[PDB]
Amino acid sequence: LGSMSSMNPEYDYLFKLLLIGDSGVGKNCLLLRFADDTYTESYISTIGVDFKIRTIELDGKTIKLQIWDTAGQERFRTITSSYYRGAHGIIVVYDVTDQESFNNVKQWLQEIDRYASENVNKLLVGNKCDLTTKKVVDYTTAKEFADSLGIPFLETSAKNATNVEQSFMTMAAEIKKRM
Amino acid sequence: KLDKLERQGKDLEDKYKTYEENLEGFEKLLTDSEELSLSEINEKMKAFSKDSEKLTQLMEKHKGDEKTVQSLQREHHDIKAKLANLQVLHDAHTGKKSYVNEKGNPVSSLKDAHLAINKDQEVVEHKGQFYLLQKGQWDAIKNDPAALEKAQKDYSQSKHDLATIKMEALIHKLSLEMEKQLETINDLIMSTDPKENEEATKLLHKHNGLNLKLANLQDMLAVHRKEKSFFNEKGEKVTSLNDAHYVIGKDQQLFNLGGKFYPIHKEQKILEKDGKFYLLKQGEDWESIKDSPEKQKKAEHDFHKLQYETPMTVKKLVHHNKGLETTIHKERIEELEHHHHH
Ligand SMILES: Nc1nc2c(ncn2[C@@H]2O[C@H](COP(=O)(O)OP(=O)(O)O)[C@@H](O)[C@H]2O)c(=O)[nH]1
């Protein structure tokens, strides 16, 4: 609550981010690696949304992030449109080992156009980049696609942490630019 | 953050207790829920109408792209159907329609309604035969077996549509409660007090608890619309959610591999070979894929992906996840508490 001897941390910005993309691509693992620095190989289905909090320092400012993971099965997705309310940035995730998840990126972009604010920021993430022998989605194809939309693109691994912090830092930098 | 781990204990505790409380209250919900008020009906109709307009605008923005436009039209048709169902309730609240039971006699509550009819319709019942027809037109059909059959079909269609409407009404009511929770959660997240931040997480648990009720209704709706079917523990078809362990598409099968059910298309099967598993079309086998590492890898990958689409009912899934999450947490705690001692 705050005394002179134990003060709660303040923040200069509070951004709401949503993770979307096919079930199984690693949205929850990205969330947990970034927010808690944990990882498990064991899959657990979602029955609804989740959020985590993490505060970062960027450009001399303190940014609190509330990061929401969306649900997977249609029966658990009734009020998806409500989670976009107040969202500053959407991170669209595919799985570099799964061509279908990449092809579906266009459907996820449609959901953003349908539900998000007009000024929302976007980032494309190709996850599971540690699975080198199982990769099927070509970097240059994905980079060209992101470039055609004017959005940033990173390949990540929630398992090894590759580019996980960078992804969120990049999204926060893009949002801050328009504040 | 060790303390985050230590806290997860009660956190998981609170989460699964909340989930189980909502699952147990489901049956009572069906009978005791509060009806939507007109204001609630209007709020949902406004929201769906705005969504409809947005989809229309996106279709224009994507003109020419048959595939994208078709996708947008599927969504738009879905929203149009929800709006028409809400319009029935609105009509009932304004007297343009009235609720009747199976004999065509008026009832007060949507709960007790079999059909909602307008002033130009009537219901005729005789010893378990049910007819819906234009008001005053019995003589036109009474000696015409084909026309009586049409009237019986019309009764059944209207009855089926109102059943859809009743489930959707409960969904909308719960949805509005959940949307209010999200505002309070945002207020709590704004706080720098970690105690308020923790309260937001507790409120999320109640939010997802209501989502479990939505999920059961969505499964009931899917089965009602003949998109999906319920199955018991042995994979035998059943009619009621109460007897179901699984729910899957009409185009799918419960495929038994190693004593576990995998939901795959009827035209697919799974092959086991020396510890590897391949999702294949019915006409393929080891002989047909042995010459193609590409086919093998894709089929293995496609089998691996099946875990992301469970066929379990909501209640069974929640129990399954509880076990898994608890086990992972206990493992982490055990390692933290003990490993350093050696
Ligand atoms: N090798 C590897 N596996 C991952 C990675 N991220 C996720 N996974 C695995 O892929 C599965 C699906 O991840 P999950 O976060 O639950 O997917 P979600 O449905 O998008 O939330 C999980 O069981 C993970 O164990 C990664 O970066 N590398």
Numbering used by the authors:
A (entry chain A): -2 to 176
B (entry chain B): 225 to 566
What do the study's own words say?
Another translocated effector protein LidA is also involved in the recruitment of early secretory vesicles to the LCV. LidA was found to interact with Rab1 as well, regardless of nucleotide binding states, and promote SidM/DrrA activity of transporting Rab1 to the LCV.
The interaction between LidA and Rab1 resulted in a 1∶1 stoichiometric complex and buried 41% (4031 Å2/9845 Å2) of the Rab1. In the structure, Rab1 is held in a large and pronounced groove made by the four “fingers” with an extensive, though not complete, charge and surface complementarities. LidA (residues 224-559) is composed of seven α-helices and ten β-strands, which arrange into a structure resembling a hand with the baby finger buried in the palm and the remaining four straightened. Unexpectedly, the structures showed that GDP-Rab1(S25N), a “constitutively” inactive mutant, adopted an active conformation when bound by LidA. Surprisingly, structural comparison revealed that the conformation of LidA-bound Rab1(S25N) is essentially identical with that of LidA-bound GTP-Rab1, indicating that Rab1(S25N) is in the active conformation following LidA binding.
